[PDB]
Design an enzyme around this catalytic site. Structure first.
Site, short mmCIF file in Angstrom:
data_model
loop_
_atom_site.label_atom_id
_atom_site.label_comp_id
_atom_site.label_asym_id
_atom_site.label_seq_id
_atom_site.Cartn_x
_atom_site.Cartn_y
_atom_site.Cartn_z
CG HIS A 260 86.31 -3.65 -34.58
ND1 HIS A 260 86.47 -3.37 -35.96
CD2 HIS A 260 84.96 -3.76 -34.39
CE1 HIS A 260 85.29 -3.42 -36.57
NE2 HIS A 260 84.35 -3.67 -35.63
CG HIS B 147 82.61 -4.96 -26.70
ND1 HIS B 147 83.28 -4.06 -27.51
CD2 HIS B 147 81.35 -5.06 -27.17
CE1 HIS B 147 82.48 -3.72 -28.52
NE2 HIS B 147 81.28 -4.29 -28.30
N1 HFF Z 1 79.17 -2.05 -30.13
S1 HFF Z 1 77.60 -1.83 -30.54
O1 HFF Z 1 76.84 -3.02 -30.19
O2 HFF Z 1 77.21 -0.60 -30.02
C1 HFF Z 1 77.57 -1.70 -32.30
C2 HFF Z 1 78.54 -0.94 -32.94
C3 HFF Z 1 78.59 -0.93 -34.32
C4 HFF Z 1 77.71 -1.69 -35.09
C5 HFF Z 1 78.02 -1.95 -36.55
C6 HFF Z 1 76.96 -1.65 -37.49
N2 HFF Z 1 77.24 -2.27 -38.78
C7 HFF Z 1 76.71 -3.41 -39.24
S2 HFF Z 1 75.84 -4.42 -38.19
N3 HFF Z 1 76.74 -3.58 -40.58
C8 HFF Z 1 77.21 -2.57 -41.54
C9 HFF Z 1 76.51 -2.56 -42.88
O3 HFF Z 1 76.95 -1.87 -43.78
N4 HFF Z 1 75.40 -3.31 -43.03
C10 HFF Z 1 74.48 -3.02 -44.14
C11 HFF Z 1 74.31 -4.25 -45.01
C12 HFF Z 1 73.93 -5.46 -44.18
C13 HFF Z 1 73.18 -6.49 -44.75
C14 HFF Z 1 72.90 -7.64 -44.03
C15 HFF Z 1 73.38 -7.78 -42.75
C16 HFF Z 1 74.11 -6.76 -42.17
C17 HFF Z 1 74.38 -5.58 -42.86
C18 HFF Z 1 75.02 -4.40 -42.12
C19 HFF Z 1 76.23 -4.78 -41.25
C20 HFF Z 1 76.71 -2.40 -34.43
C21 HFF Z 1 76.63 -2.41 -33.04
ZN ZN Z 2 79.30 -3.88 -29.23
#
Ligand code: HFF
Ligand code: ZN
Ligand code: HFF
Ligand code: NAG
Ligand code: NAG
Ligand code: NAG
Ligand code: NAG
Ligand code: NAG
Ligand code: ZN
Lengths: 276, 277
Positions: free
Chosen positions: B65, B96
């Protein structure tokens, strides 16, 4: 008896026609070299601020060499130290631009020319009570250089011309030297907000027109403000004064000077600033 | 499953497929309205700063994405209060963009779309010990939005791609999902210096992708950083994931949400910041 485009009175002749001080070795503009500059973390964010009690009008003049905004006394100020105590008082703002979009600025940044450079001219009111007292004296002046770059996609309100209030529509082919017109005030605080006021080159240099007085504290912001092609074209409609060879005002910039010509008796250093 | 371009799984369906929380009334992105915003002089200049002891590697992935930069732990921080005491810790940065130069951003400023919006994602380390603790909890996240604008005349060194180190050349047609590659570190301090870090919109909102969690403190800078047409077309070389109808990655933005939908039970306010004048 000086010009940009008449080879009899043009910038190559100034060192001979105005030896005090266009023959000197602390001249402006210079090439602002990121690699051959010294970072000085003590150089603080620049603030521009207004005396809200001031009511006198702003004007703009076609002076035959540039478009010059003339600010009324005791109205617009610069602070380099975070104190709003009127150490530097703004007098005028004028512009340098090119016949074409690939040149125009006086200063270059790592050899790159911008299409337009604005000069916000202040006197050191901390020491000198008037501009006429400051303009010819040591340490009298401080000038801010504002680079402008052209973009195809932008809202009017996010361009530098919003801060200029479009010069109240005064720029056209009939705005002839030495005419001046009253204009709505320039929002210089909005203009500064359009770039990063912590990120700049700093050096001791000169006026870039005769007599090239070596009494200017220079600050040139590295990030440009944004304008449109239609906006740069409003400056190019202005007519040059009769001492010029070219008819339309353009290429009203001095050639690049060396930081340290070979005859210097004390080298100057180019400094740069960035945020905490 | 969700997508941007498959009408069966696309943004108009998220409120039904992910009701927690894509059906909420504090959603992002929004139209950032200069006139209909409250100037708050108390909101300070944003600082981004690095732990100079960190040696760990940065990576980037095509997650199907976006292009997402994953920062190592304990490396890059945000300060909103001038103190360098690690209250917000940066996790990742993603992007984006548009099929064409006149759209791509998620936020709008007075209705205007930029070609590219970067999202620097941080967690409130002040309260939560890890990203996985913060990402689903109240008040867990703070995101910085960085608008980019295309210029014809510029040196590489003054473009955002200098801060990005060109993402070490990974933006190309062969960077297929879910490939990840080691890249040079991103100079996020240099990136922030390309704009005015005192001039921003501020509001409480959401993630812009499912599940749209309403736990994001948003900061969107008003001044854009600068890129070339050549640089924006690099992003357009990435392939979308197999969930998408479109082959090439582009138009990977959520539609605009209202600041206060009709069903809201407590109105939020859009704030603006500007430099100590
Ligand atoms: N488009 S936005 O800026 O609004 C936005 C939309 C969606 C997100 C995604 C959030 N997910 C993210 S940022 N994830 C998922 C996860 O399981 N962990 C948990 C484990 C972990 C450990 C170290 C470093 C990172 C992580 C994050 C990464 C972040 C930001
Ligand atoms: Zn974003
Ligand atoms: N291109 S630049 O930025 O290096 C630069 C080049 C040359 C100058 C010219 C400075 N002259 C300027 S800005 N002058 C001339 C004068 O005799 N008086 C003295 C009288 C007076 C009274 C009130 C208000 C203003 C003044 C100035 C205006 C200023 C700045
Ligand atoms: C610091 C400064 O220059 N302050 C001036 C003040 O002297 C002047 O009397 C008033 C009305 O014009 O505007 C303000
Ligand atoms: C600042 C300046 O020079 N102002 C002049 C004024 O003296 C002149 O009478 C008027 C009309 O010609 O235009 C303007
Ligand atoms: C120095 C570096 O890391 N990256 C390069 C730069 O030198 C080059 O001019 C540009 C265009 O190919 O892309 C980037
Ligand atoms: C700006 O001024 C010019 C005349 O110099 C005019 O043609 C143009 O429409 C003006 N634009 C505005 C006010 O937005
Ligand atoms: C900085 O990095 C070092 C080693 O990588 C680490 O042990 C330390 O905890 C980090 N500092 C912070 C505030 O996270
Ligand atoms: Zn000048």
């Amino acid at each position: 008896e000086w010009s940009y485009t008449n080879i009899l009175t043009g910038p190559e002749t100034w060192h001979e026609h105005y030896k005090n001080m266009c023959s000197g070795y602390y001249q402006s503009p210079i090439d602002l070299k990121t690699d051959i500059s010294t970072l000085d973390l003590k150089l603080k964010t620049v603030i521009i601020y207004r005396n809200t009690s001031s009511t006198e009008t702003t004007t703009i003049q076609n002076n035959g060499h540039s478009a010059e905004v003339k600010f009324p006394r005791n109205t617009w100020f610069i602070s380099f130290d975070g104190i709003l105590d009127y150490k530097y008082e703004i007098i005028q703002m004028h512009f340098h631009w090119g016949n074409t979009d690939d040149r125009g600025s006086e200063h270059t940044i790592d050899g790159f020319r911008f299409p337009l450079e604005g000069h916000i001219v202040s006197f050191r009111r901390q020491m000198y009570s008037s501009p006429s007292e400051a303009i010819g004296r040591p340490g009298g002046l401080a000038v801010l250089g504002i680079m402008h770059q052209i973009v195809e996609s932008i809202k009017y309100e996010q361009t530098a011309f919003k801060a200029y209030n479009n010069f109240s529509g005064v720029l056209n082919s009939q705005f002839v030297p030495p005419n001046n017109s009253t204009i709505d005030d320039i929002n210089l605080a909005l203009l500064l907000s359009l770039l990063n006021p912590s990120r700049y080159f700093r050096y001791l240099g000169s006026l870039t027109t005769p007599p090239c007085t070596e009494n200017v504290l220079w600050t040139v912001f590295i990030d440009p403000v944004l304008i449109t092609r239609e906006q740069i074209n409003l400056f190019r409609n202005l007519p040059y004064g009769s001492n010029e060879k070219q008819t339309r005002m353009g290429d009203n910039f001095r050639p690049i000077q060396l930081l340290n010509p070979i005859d210097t008796l004390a080298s100057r250093t180019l400094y740069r600033a960035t945020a905490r």
